[PDB]
Amino acid sequence: EXXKXXPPXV
Numbered sequence: 449e450x451x452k453x454x455p456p457x458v
Contacts, residue, residue, distance in 0.1 A: 449458055
């Protein structure tokens with residue numbers, strides 16, 4: 449969740 453993004457369930 450939030451920030452840059454990246455992998456799932458962030």
